[PDB]
Design a protein around this ligand. Structure first.
Ligand SMILES: Nc1nc2c(ncn2[C@@H]2O[C@H](COP(=O)(O)OP(=O)(O)O)[C@@H](O)[C@H]2O)c(=O)[nH]1
Ligand SMILES: [Mg+2]
Length: 244
């Protein structure tokens, strides 16, 4: 479908997205496919709707047995495909049936970028997070991690008491990255080489805006263009995409 949501982005965001997608088109990539994975309730669907700028997937405090969905939008000969998914944990365990459904849904498809999504405003990683990584590695292979971005939602979180945002967020992202390294079995150099970048998101209607009317992080940066910059970076990193 035509990309109506694009028209609703502020000019400053439009400008950046055109630059990013324009770079892909120059390399004769006239489309890209983004897979989104995560536990339930972390804002996967919300982040998808933020990226498309339309209500294309269902958001809810409760996890609906639901199926993967591909949302596709096209503009000036360029097409973005984003695959939203059911959560990867159920009742304190990894949901392997969800993973198999997702994998089944991906047959024949080429995945340019994985977004592995979790919340910023969480105080610990636990064994379940590592098991989610382990299961993703078993389903798609170790190589998925060289095409992945860690996306942390609820970025407008303000930590309690004396704690700085920067200390809290660097600890949260570090702990997750170390979990990815552990669950993927990657050696320290191998892991450094995968170069997994951390991107922040705030899907709340109450998100701060910068002075160009763009949804902004506490540092003032426009987060939707940041995330698109990171996606298009990974899409064109010349590591091989993920075929299933
Ligand atoms: N404050 C805030 N709430 C969010 C954010 N992302 C999602 N939510 C809320 O968290 C709940 C789950 O969101 P959803 O997108 O359905 O998560 P999913 O199960 O991972 O697909 C919903 O009630 C959303 O409104 C975020 O960045 N900030
Ligand atoms: Mg969802």
């Amino acid at each position: 479908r035509e990309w109506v949501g694009f028209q609703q982005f502020p000019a400053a965001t439009q400008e950046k997205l055109i630059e990013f997608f324009g770079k892909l088109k120059q390399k004769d990539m006239n489309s890209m496919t983004v897979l989104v994975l995560g536990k339930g309730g972390v804002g996967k669907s919300s982040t998808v709707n933020s990226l498309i700028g339309e209500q294309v997937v269902r958001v809810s405090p409760f996890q609906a047995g639901l199926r993967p969905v591909m949302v596709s939008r096209t503009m000036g000969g360029f097409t973005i495909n984003i695959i939203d998914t059911p959560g990867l944990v159920e009742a304190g365990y990894v949901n392997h049936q969800a993973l198999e459904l997702i994998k089944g849904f991906l047959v024949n498809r080429t995945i340019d970028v994985l977004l592995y999504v979790d919340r910023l405003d969480v105080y610990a990683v636990d064994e379940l997070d590592k098991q989610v990584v382990i299961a993703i590695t078993q389903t798609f292979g170790k190589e998925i991690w060289c095409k992945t971005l860690l996306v942390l939602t609820h970025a407008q979180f303000s930590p309690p008491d004396e704690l700085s945002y920067e200390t809290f967020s660097s600890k949260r992202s570090d702990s997750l990255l170390k979990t990815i390294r552990a669950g993927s079995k990657m050696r320290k150099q191998e892991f450094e080489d995968s170069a997994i970048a951390v991107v922040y998101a705030e899907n709340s209607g109450r998100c701060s805006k910068n002075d160009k009317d763009e949804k902004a992080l506490p540092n003032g940066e426009a987060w939707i263009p940041n995330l698109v910059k990171a996606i298009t970076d990974v899409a064109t990193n010349q590591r091989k995409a993920i075929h299933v």
